[PDB]
């Protein structure tokens, strides 16, 4: 992530796949997603397919998979309340408060 | 489906504010009014480029005083000058109470609202302004129609929000019957600041201008005479100052506040005038020669 | 200057005292 050279990243995953340490290749991709810029993660995807690094890496870097992962923490231990919505109609005037 | 029709925060330029302060100040105790000309762009900015006063009211800010005829007459002239601008709103002064409209004034305000929704009403208090941004609020008219729609919260939205303060009777009464309050913020450019400053030719020249040598000697002697008075209090204060806080010690062993401070201010003013004049004198003599 | 220094000397006694109080508290604990 500091270097921000897409060519460097593609090379680490390639070597771990060839060794048949797929797991290792996989970890760097989820770790990379959190910190890195999105533009930077997008460039990797194009380069990985071509080397022939497995398809698995591609999903997590996309950022489609990551949302679902967060959902289980939020959904399980989810607080909600209707009451605030109602407080704004009845109590105060609605425009400033409403937003 | 809904529209906008909100009161946006009013950007008042440096010249327009000065024209409002000047209009009011001459104008009071008599209630007076005049128009605001500007351009409104976006849906957030109204810039008040200029103002002028369209004939000043008598008793009240009367509905007689609002004149489409004068407004029309002035507006066509502007076109010929090659500055066509539109009436952004209007301003009035009340000396009665800070940030308050009169009863007559709310009716007068309605004629401007019909013309443009972005018509604003500025209350200027020259009596109670000694910073000149103070006790000026931008306001908007509350009709029976406006209150039923709920236009009043709608105004706070799109800016930083502003409620008035001066007087208790004027805030409760004003809020219900007269108006809703909204914000004024100020933009004045660097050129406006440069003209604001009043660069002045003699102002800098004085710095060099040499004062009499006898006058410095005379002053030196006068200044010493103030320190002498302070010196009796100062001898007593200094004997014991063996705990903490110099000011307490000084009062305790006689000498109101700080005898040291008084002494120091007295030399500083004399030192300042003598020091600059000596710097200036040596420089001028050599330069001119 | 002289006034702040006379006070500064008094501050010194409290400030020294703090480092010694800690010592005395550490020792009461290790000795039981």
UniProtKB/TrEMBL annotation, chain B:
Among InterPro entries, the record links this protein to: JAMM/MPN+_dom, JAMM_MPN+_peptidase_M67A, MPN, RPN11_C
GO molecular function terms here? endopeptidase activator activity; metal ion binding; metal-dependent deubiquitinase activity; proteasome binding
For whether the record's keyword set contains Mitochondrion, the answer is no
Per its UniProt record, what SUPFAM superfamilies does this chain match? Answer: JAB1/MPN domain
Give the coiled coil ranges.
none
Pfam family of the protein (one): RPN11_C
Does this entry carry the keyword Coiled coil? Answer: no
Entry GO terms, CC = proteasome regulatory particle, lid subcomplex
Domain named MPN: which ranges? 10-145
Q: Gene3D superfamilies recorded for this chain?
A: Cytidine Deaminase, domain 2
The family database entries (SMART domains) matched by this protein are listed as: JAB_MPN
Annotated GO biological processes are: double-strand break repair via homologous recombination; double-strand break repair via nonhomologous end joining; protein K63-linked deubiquitination; proteolysis; regulation of proteasomal protein catabolic process
Provide the alphabetized UniProt keywords. Hydrolase, Metal-binding, Metalloprotease, Protease, Proteasome, Zinc
Q: What protein does this entry describe?
A: Proteasome (Prosome, macropain) 26S subunit, non-ATPase, 14
UniProtKB/TrEMBL annotation, chain C:
Q: Which domain of life is it from?
A: Eukaryota
Please give the first and last residues shown and the length of the full protein.
263 to 294 of 326
Give the UniProt family note. Answer: Belongs to the peptidase M67A family.
> This chain belongs to which protein, by name?
Proteasome 26S subunit, non-ATPase 7
Q: Which gene encodes it?
A: Psmd7
């Amino acid at each position: 992530i500091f270097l921000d050279d897409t060519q460097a990243v593609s090379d680490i995953l390639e070597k771990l796949v060839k060794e048949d340490n797929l797991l290792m290749a996989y970890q760097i991709c989820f770790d990379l997603y959190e910190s890195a810029s999105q533009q930077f993660l997008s460039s990797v995807i194009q380069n990985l397919r071509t080397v022939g690094t497995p398809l698995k890496m591609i999903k997590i870097l996309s950022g489609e998979m990551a949302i679902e992962l967060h959902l289980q923490f939020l959904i399980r231990n989810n607080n909600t309340d209707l009451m605030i919505l109602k407080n704004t109609k009845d109590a105060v005037r609605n425009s400033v408060c409403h937003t | 489906a809904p529209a906008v029709d909100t009161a946006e925060q009013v950007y008042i330029s440096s010249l327009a504010l000065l024209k409002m302060l000047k209009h009011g100040r001459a104008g009071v105790p008599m209630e007076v009014m005049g128009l605001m000309l500007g351009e409104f762009v976006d849906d957030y900015t109204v810039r008040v480029i200029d103002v002028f006063a369209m004939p000043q009211s008598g008793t009240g800010v009367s509905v007689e005083a609002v004149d489409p005829v004068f407004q029309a007459k002035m507006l066509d002239m502007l076109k010929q000058t090659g500055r066509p601008e539109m009436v952004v709103g209007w301003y009035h002064s009340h000396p009665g109470f800070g940030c308050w409209l009169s009863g007559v004034d709310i009716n007068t305000q309605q004629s401007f609202e019909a013309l443009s929704e972005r018509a604003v009403a500025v209350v200027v208090d020259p009596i109670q302004s000694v910073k000149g941004k103070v006790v000026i609020d931008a306001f908007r008219l509350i009709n029976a129609n406006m209150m039923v729609l709920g236009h009043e919260p709608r105004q706070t939205t799109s800016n930083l929000g502003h409620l008035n303060k001066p007087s208790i009777q004027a805030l409760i009464h004003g809020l219900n019957r007269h108006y809703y309050s909204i914000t004024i913020n100020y933009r004045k450019n660097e050129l406006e600041q440069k003209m604001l400053l009043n660069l002045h030719k003699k102002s800098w020249m004085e710095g060099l201008t040499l004062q009499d040598y006898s006058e410095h000697c005379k002053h030196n002697e006068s200044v010493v005479k103030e320190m002498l008075e302070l010196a009796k209090n100062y001898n007593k204060a200094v004997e014991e100052e063996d705990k903490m806080t110099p000011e307490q010690l000084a009062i305790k062993n006689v000498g109101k506040q700080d005898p040291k401070r008084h002494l120091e201010e007295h030399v500083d003013v004399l030192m300042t005038s003598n020091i600059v004049q000596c710097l200036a004198a040596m420089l001028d003599t050599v330069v001119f020669k | 200057m002289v006034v702040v220094y006379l006070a500064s000397l008094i501050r010194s006694v409290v400030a020294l005292h703090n480092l010694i109080n800690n010592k005395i508290a550490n020792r009461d604990a290790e000795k039981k």
